[PDB]
Nucleic acid binder design. Structure first.
Ligand SMILES: [K+]
Ligand SMILES: [Mg+2]
Ligand SMILES: [Mg+2]
Ligand SMILES: [Mg+2]
Ligand SMILES: [Mg+2]
Ligand SMILES: [Mg+2]
Ligand SMILES: [Mg+2]
Ligand SMILES: [Mg+2]
Ligand SMILES: [Mg+2]
Ligand SMILES: [Zn+2]
Lengths: 36, 206, 165, 142
RNA sequence: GGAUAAACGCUGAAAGCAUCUAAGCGUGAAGCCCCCCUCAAGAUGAGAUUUCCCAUUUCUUCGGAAAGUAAGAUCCCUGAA
RNA sequence: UUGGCACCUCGAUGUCGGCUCGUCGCAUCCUGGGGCUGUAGUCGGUCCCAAGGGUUGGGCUGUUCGCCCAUUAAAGCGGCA
């Protein structure tokens, strides 16, 4: 995980979602896991 | 779970079959009797009320006499409840000998520690003496109460006072020997309290 | 929205039951939804078309359908073991795994779930409750999930393990 | 000159029962406080307890809107350093709801000798049953 | 042990897929509540159980009082664990 | 922290360092849990949750700091005149 205010897609496979009131992105790439 | 009350007779040491040497406290646990059997419906908690020593009817009184007569025995000096214990055992009036235990059986010993009087902090609470030279005029005093900002000193700042008399349980002691004739129980190591003190021995919670 | 042979759907307010050849499934749904019944088919609707009701419409439909497909055909999930020494067995109705730890790990399949050992490198979960099937498969996989550098561990058979140098 | 001031014992004082099921903690407590202080009566006199005695049942079913079950936090302090102990409103509703409504209503009563005396007139039960049938009490509706 | 954090997930839509969440389920920390030790009913919310003493006499128009006792406890005395 | 302001105190609010006693925060040093890894394993880097407990003894200096010797699981940063 990378915890950042700047949660944005890093590729085209990244997918923004809203889990527990927080913006995450999930991708197949584990690096792209972003939390806000 | 199983328990008795006893008096501390003293300390000695015993050789085991290995030739190892084992200090032991001696507990004399005569005249133990069951006096009342408390229930969840009568009281709210299950327990067994044991009385330990026989005493004289002029040191007793008519209330205690009645309570023991409901058990069909004499007035008693020490009376104590034990919990976490089965009540299908322990019929009223029954005598409760040391033979309930066994060698190597494992216990908690609960008693009232010895009386040191008014003591200071380094003995009581283990604090450190300040230097005794190099100009010190601070040897056995307690230290700073605290900082300035509260305008007060916090609770549990530890200070002189009356040291002992506190109740203490020692855990996971081992029973070495049982002698039903002498009404004697041997315990590896120690227990709290002076000689002639009451000890409450019971099967260990863990 | 099929209701195949043998299935019986019953309702009482927010509660519901579905019986069938393979088990009973008593569950609940929130009452705000609306039901309509045919002998082979049961439909669902939402009164107001606001956020929660949209969320719950397809949810409730899918969950009913899962209940139905479970009682009528059940569910299977396949886990394969990858790695020398990684061994599976069942002592009757108790799975046991021997996967390179200094001990084995055992599992019990709760009421409605069942295990199967078609081989030492292969185990399968079976049930009529999809939730329990997936959960027990997930927990069984959780013991040695796949490492990338070789793939050594449990995995679903159609899982796309990522590997590295 | 001349306007009525009550006297202790001058006023009949009744015993009321409330089903706390589904009502919000604060709304129920606000109605109960006024009953206890005696503002439903025109015999009200600020320095005298004209109010009634009150019973609350099914307190474990008291309503808590929002995430208050997890996020409304009750605090106690032992006056020892770090003697702060927290507990959630939902947990209290489950285990010790009597103390919950007690806490709510205490902060809504006056902070005096009288208000302390008024708190004693409250008898709370998380169940449907109470001990005070001997007083044969009436239902109150909010 | 019970419930959680971060985290991992099951099922599952909103949004014919996908998604650990939105409804709902599970795992999950030396931490939280308990387990263990101690104090604790002045806990004026003053709790409970067991046993004991009994319903005296003067008065006072009432309230209420005092004046000897019971169960029991002490002044006093020998003392220490 | 360096500073700026000069608002209480000049009919007195005692200073550095140390000793005694600690207590609090978390921006966690160790122990504990976890995600990413340019994570093979051992070791590690970075980041999230965690403040429960623990966090050395000496040589030089008045010294804080700092250098050094030797250990440690670790030898935390800071607030409380
Ligand atoms: K000055
Ligand atoms: Mg020293
Ligand atoms: Mg001196
Ligand atoms: Mg758990
Ligand atoms: Mg002055
Ligand atoms: Mg001065
Ligand atoms: Mg942090
Ligand atoms: Mg020097
Ligand atoms: Mg030096
Ligand atoms: Zn991506």
């Amino acid at each position: 995980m990378k915890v950042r205010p700047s949660v944005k897609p890093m590729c085209e496979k990244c997918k923004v979602i809203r889990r527990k009131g927080k913006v995450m992105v999930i991708c197949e790439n584990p690096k792209h896991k972003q939390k806000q | 779970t199983k328990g008795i009350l006893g008096r501390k007779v003293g300390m000695t040491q015993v050789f085991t079959e290995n030739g190892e040497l084992i200090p032991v406290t001696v507990i004399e646990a005569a005249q133990n009797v069951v006096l009342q059997k408390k229930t969840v419906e009568t009281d709210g908690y299950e327990a067994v009320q044991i009385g330990f020593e026989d005493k004289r009817a002029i040191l007793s009184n008519k209330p205690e006499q009645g309570h023991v007569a409901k058990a069909n025995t004499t007035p008693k000096r020490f009376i104590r409840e034990f919990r976490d214990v089965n009540l299908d055992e322990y019929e009223i009036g029954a005598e409760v000998k040391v033979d309930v235990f066994a060698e190597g059986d494992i216990i908690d010993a609960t008693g009232v520690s010895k009386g040191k009087g008014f003591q200071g902090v380094i003995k009581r609470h283990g604090q450190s003496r300040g230097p005794m030279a190099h100009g010190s005029r601070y040897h056995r005093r307690p230290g700073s109460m605290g900082p300035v900002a509260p305008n007060r000193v916090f609770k549990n700042k530890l200070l002189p006072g009356r040291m002992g008399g506190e109740q203490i349980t020692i855990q996971n002691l081992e029973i070495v020997k049982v002698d039903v004739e002498k009404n004697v129980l041997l315990v590896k190591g120690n227990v709290p309290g002076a000689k002639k003190a009451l000890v409450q021995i019971k099967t260990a919670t863990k | 929205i099929v209701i195949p042979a043998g299935v019986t759907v019953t309702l009482n307010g927010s509660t519901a039951t579905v019986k069938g050849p393979k088990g009973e499934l008593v569950k609940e749904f929130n009452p705000e939804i609306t039901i309509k019944i045919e002998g082979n088919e049961i439909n669902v609707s939402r009164p107001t078309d606001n956020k929660n009701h949209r969320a719950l419409h397809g949810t409730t439909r899918a969950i009913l359908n899962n209940m139905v497909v479970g009682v009528s055909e059940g569910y299977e999930k396949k886990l394969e073991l990858i790695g020398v020494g990684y061994r599976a067995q069942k002592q009757g109705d108790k799975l046991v795994l021997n996967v390179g730890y200094s001990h084995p790990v055992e599992f019990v399949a709760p009421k409605g779930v069942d295990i199967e050992v078609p081989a030492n490198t292969q185990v399968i979960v079976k049930g009529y409750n999809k939730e329990h099937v997936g959960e027990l498969a997930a927990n069984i996989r959780a013991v040695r999930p796949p490492e990338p550098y070789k793939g050594k561990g449990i995995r679903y058979e159609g899982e796309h393990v990522r590997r590295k140098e | 000159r001349t306007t009525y001031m009550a006297k202790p014992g001058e006023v009949e004082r009744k015993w009321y029962v409330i089903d706390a099921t589904g009502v919000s903690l604060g709304r129920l407590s606000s109605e109960v406080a006024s009953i206890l202080r005696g503002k439903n009566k025109p015999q009200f006199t600020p320095h005298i307890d004209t109010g009634d005695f009150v019973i609350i049942i099914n307190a474990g079913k008291i309503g808590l809107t929002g995430k208050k079950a997890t996020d409304k936090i009750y605090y106690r302090h032992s006056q020892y350093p770090g003697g702060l102990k927290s507990r959630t409103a939902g947990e209290m509703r489950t285990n010790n709801p009597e103390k919950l409504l007690e806490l709510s209503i205490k902060g809504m009563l006056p902070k005096n000798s009288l208000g302390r005396q008024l708190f004693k007139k409250l008898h709370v039960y998380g169940g449907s049953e109470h001990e005070h049938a001997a007083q044969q009490p009436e239902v109150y509706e909010l």
